[PDB]
């Protein structure tokens, strides 16, 4: 038993992680097959950072504009393209400890383990989720970009994120692996600021079934509530409207545990309501929202069949 | 910037976890060399655990008793001993992937990454705290035994965990990769019971630190305190007495910051006394801490020379 913020294992994409440079930028690139994937500002200089012509900069260079280094070992750039803001570099070498992989795109709510990367080197390793805002509260420096984020499914390695900026309010913004931004965000150091947050409600209470099968029970109530009901409660603490696709997906948990859905969501509206009087949930006093339902099964009970 | 429960990439020590079966026991072993580090309790079984005999068992069995496969491929053990509660079995191949490395023996308070491991497979990552009570709060379930704890220090894998049992608290114990129990714990299923656990206070004003490196400086006031006054407001809220190594320890971040420690105390006697008004440090609305010092430096700026 137990309940922690765990992350992916790291090692397969440990792997692919290699640097790149291009002039008086350096960062982390993305070694799978024979190509490298990394943020196309790598063709920037800082002094030109502000409002970029990628196009123009894109032409400007040569396969010998690029050093790639996995570790020690250069490896020959053989061709180079853009597609939206990441580039692709040919390389002259397929990488042999590639793994098994996918390019998703991710949901807003959904989660996903961020190997962050320096000097395209592996420097530590933790969870975060998509907000609603298409933002992510990570932890990243000046030499991160091009650190990516992933989930794993069996062997299989499903990209989701890569990193480009930093806004602000301190706040992470990148791509899928194809380069498109989540959220309408650039890749320019301009004024853009993110939509205001909101808490992912199907997540708050998926970490409420995770206490209740790790014996946290003392939030259970002998109430319940219709759905409109409780988002007239949970809208006025900036929880985003449940939605019926919420409850559906909450179903499994329900089952395992014996608490209806919307039972939990009774015991959700009197701790909004009422708050947690000094006590603490799996160690928390705020509702956690960076566990999905499939996060919880996986952790209670899908490891021991890895 | 941004500031995350962060644990070390796993890879290096994914390549050196195995399965370890000795007869109706199955776990993970550590292989290092030409040596299989796990639990002795591998060679139970369920019905003689209670308070079984490890040196008539370890006898009765031969090499031929143990089958430990990394992945699919069998390894022949060609010796066995016993070194406190841990099984060493050596086999004929030395890991290839064996990492640079140490055993080490950690005091509480500080930190670690865990390797949680099933059927000798990694299934996750999470960072934890040895705790005053020598326990840790894990996420640990069936199978699980073998998992270990680690720091990395530039190549090196310093090993200072390996687990072997839940307390009924839900609290987890273990020993160090020379077999000998973190707390006074043995490995049979008897009723133990954990000393009351108690709050890691260096740990929590470096974590102050780092929520003032990060521009979170709200909780800052114009006071200061003798060690002592502190002491007096702290073990009133079960917080460990601040030593004055623990000061000295502090010392770095203060100077990172200009905050003087004993001027972080006075901040920290207030966030005890007056709370935090539904205001929250680093998005925490309690007082965390699983972050030593080091930790602090290491994600804030050491991570960048990676
Ligand atoms: C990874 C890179 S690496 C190489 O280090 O590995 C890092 C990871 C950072 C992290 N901590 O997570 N990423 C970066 O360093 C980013 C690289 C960028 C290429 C994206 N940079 C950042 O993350 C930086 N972040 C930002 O800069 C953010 C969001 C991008 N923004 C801000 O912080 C706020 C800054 O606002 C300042 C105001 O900026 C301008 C306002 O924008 C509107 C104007 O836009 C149109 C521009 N117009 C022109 O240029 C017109 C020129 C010609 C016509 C002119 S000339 C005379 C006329 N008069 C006029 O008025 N106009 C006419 C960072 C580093 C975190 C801060
Ligand atoms: C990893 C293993 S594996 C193989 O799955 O990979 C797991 C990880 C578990 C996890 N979730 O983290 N680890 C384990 O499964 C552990 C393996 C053990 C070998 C350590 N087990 C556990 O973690 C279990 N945990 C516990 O069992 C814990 C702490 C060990 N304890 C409890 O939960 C509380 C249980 O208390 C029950 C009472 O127990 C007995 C009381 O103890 C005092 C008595 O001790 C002396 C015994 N005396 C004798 O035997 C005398 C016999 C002869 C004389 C008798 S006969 C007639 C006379 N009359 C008398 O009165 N006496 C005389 C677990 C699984 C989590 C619960
Ligand atoms: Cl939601
Ligand atoms: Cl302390
Ligand atoms: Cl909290
Ligand atoms: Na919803
Ligand atoms: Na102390």
Chains 1, 2 share one sequence.
Not at 181 to 210: C, E, S
Request: charge should be negative; proline fraction near 4%; glycine fraction near 8%.
């Amino acid at each position: 038993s137990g309940f922690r913020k765990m992350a992916f294992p790291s090692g397969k994409v440990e792997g692919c992680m290699v640097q790149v440079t291009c002039g008086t930028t350096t960062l982390n690139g993305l070694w799978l097959d024979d190509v490298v994937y990394c943020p196309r500002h790598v063709i920037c200089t800082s002094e030109d950072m502000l409002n970029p012509n990628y196009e123009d900069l894109l032409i400007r260079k040569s396969n010998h504009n690029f050093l790639v280094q996995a570790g020690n070992v250069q490896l020959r750039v053989i061709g180079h393209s853009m597609q939206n803001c990441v580039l692709k570099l040919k390389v002259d070498t397929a990488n042999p400890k590639t793994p098994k992989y996918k390019f998703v795109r991710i949901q807003p709510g959904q989660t996903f383990s961020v190997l962050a990367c320096y000097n395209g080197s592996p420097s530590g390793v933790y969870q975060c989720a998509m907000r609603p805002n298409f933002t992510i509260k990570g932890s990243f420096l000046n030499g991160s970009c091009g650190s990516v984020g992933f989930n794993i499914d069996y062997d299989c390695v499903s990209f989701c994120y890569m990193h480009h900026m930093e806004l602000p309010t301190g706040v992470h913004a990148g791509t899928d692996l194809e380069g498109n931004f989540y959220g309408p965000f650039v890749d320019r150091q301009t004024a853009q600021a993110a939509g205001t947050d909101t808490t992912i409600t199907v997540n708050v209470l998926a970490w409420l079934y995770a206490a209740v099968i790790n014996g946290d029970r003392w939030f259970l109530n002998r109430f319940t509530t219709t759905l409109n009901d409780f988002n007239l409660v949970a809208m006025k603490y900036n929880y985003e409207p449940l939605t019926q696709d919420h409850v559906d997906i909450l179903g499994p948990l329900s089952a395992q545990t014996g608490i209806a859905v919307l039972d939990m969501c009774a015991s959700l509206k009197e701790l909004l309501q009422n708050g947690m009087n000094g006590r603490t949930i799996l160690g928390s006093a705020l509702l956690e929202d960076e566990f999905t339902p499939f996060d919880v099964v996986r952790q209670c009970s899908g490891v021991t069949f890895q």
